Amino acid sequence: KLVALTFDDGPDNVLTARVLDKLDKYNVKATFMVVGQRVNDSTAAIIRRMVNSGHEIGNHSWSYSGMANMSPDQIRKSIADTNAVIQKYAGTTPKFFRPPNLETSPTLFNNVDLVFVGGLTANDWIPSTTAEQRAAAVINGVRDGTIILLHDVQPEPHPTPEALDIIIPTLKSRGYEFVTLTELFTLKGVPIDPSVKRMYNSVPL
């Protein structure tokens, strides 16, 4: 039984390191869907720390704008510029894309050559919700193959790192193992094929 823990909306040197510290504590791998505007010399080391620690990096666009109604040139620029900064500091190229706001269109699918991922959400962008509530949303929603969509970066209070102290032990005790997105596809025997123009919330579709 496999799940993929994924985190949007960083990197942030302070908030992302809180998530990375919990993943180090439990020796778990995850995937970070990063925003190009945030990837720069100040955040180079923490982006590299993801790679160094066995995590994967995917693309969450240059910024925080929905992309469904953008033009092909706007889409291409946003994805390419984000890939270029990830390559500079991480030395890797994304295979996966998470659309801002999970909003898609045929034009967006047509102009992004990455595998689109969504996933099970946990209301963890709502500061009034507690660590325990965020954990309960995840634990009760997963199944074998689920992609879990959390945020490493949001306005505070943001007790997502604290939710991991419940999510990770609970799911392990139920027989789950945590994997990156690439590992999830590979271990399930699903080609990571960007010509598939569907959004994956789990693997297999």
How many residues of this chain bind Co ion (CB under 5 A)? 2
Phi, psi at 149, each rounded to 5°:
-100, 105
If the CB atoms of residues 9 and 56 are measured against Co ion, the closer one turns out to be 9
Stretch that binds Co ion, among 7-15, 83-91, 120-128, 188-196 (CB under 5 A): 7-15
* DSSP for residue 73: H
User: CA distances (Å), 149 to each of 33, 76, 102, 135, in order?
Assistant: 10, 24, 11, 12
* DSSP for residue 191: -
9 binds Co ion (CB under 5 A): yes
Is 151 a residue of the active site?
yes
56 binds Co ion (CB under 5 A): no
Stretch that binds Co ion, among 8-16, 68-76, 117-125, 160-168 (CB under 5 A): 8-16
Residue in 47, 55, 51, 56 with CA at minimum distance from that of residue 13: 47
152 binds Co ion (CB under 5 A): no
SS (H, E, C) 85-132: HHHHHHCCCCCEECCHHHCCCHHHHHHCCCEEECCECCCCCCCCCCHH
If the CB atoms of residues 31 and 171 are measured against Co ion, the closer one turns out to be 31
- Contact predicate 135/167, CB 8 Å: yes
* DSSP for residue 189: T
Residue in 129, 170, 169 with CA at minimum distance from that of residue 150: 129
Question: Which residue among 4, 5, 7, 8 contacts Co ion (CB under 5 A)?
Answer: 8
Which amino acid does the sequence have at 107? T
- Contact predicate 78/60, CB 8 Å: no
If the CB atoms of residues 9 and 124 are measured against Co ion, the closer one turns out to be 9
Q: Per the structure block, which two tokens stand in for 120? A: 């099970």
If the CB atoms of residues 4 and 171 are measured against Co ion, the closer one turns out to be 4
Stretch that binds Co ion, among 6-14, 85-93, 115-123, 142-150 (CB under 5 A): 6-14
Is 152 a residue of the active site?
no
If the CB atoms of residues 99 and 161 are measured against Co ion, the closer one turns out to be 99
Nearest approach, Cβ of residue 34 and Co ion (Å) = 10
Stretch that binds Co ion, among 4-12, 73-81, 158-166, 173-181 (CB under 5 A): 4-12
Q: Which of 124, 151, 152, 158 is catalytic?
A: 151
User: Where does this chain bind Co ion (CB under 5 A)?
Assistant: 8-9
Residues assigned a catalytic role = 8, 151
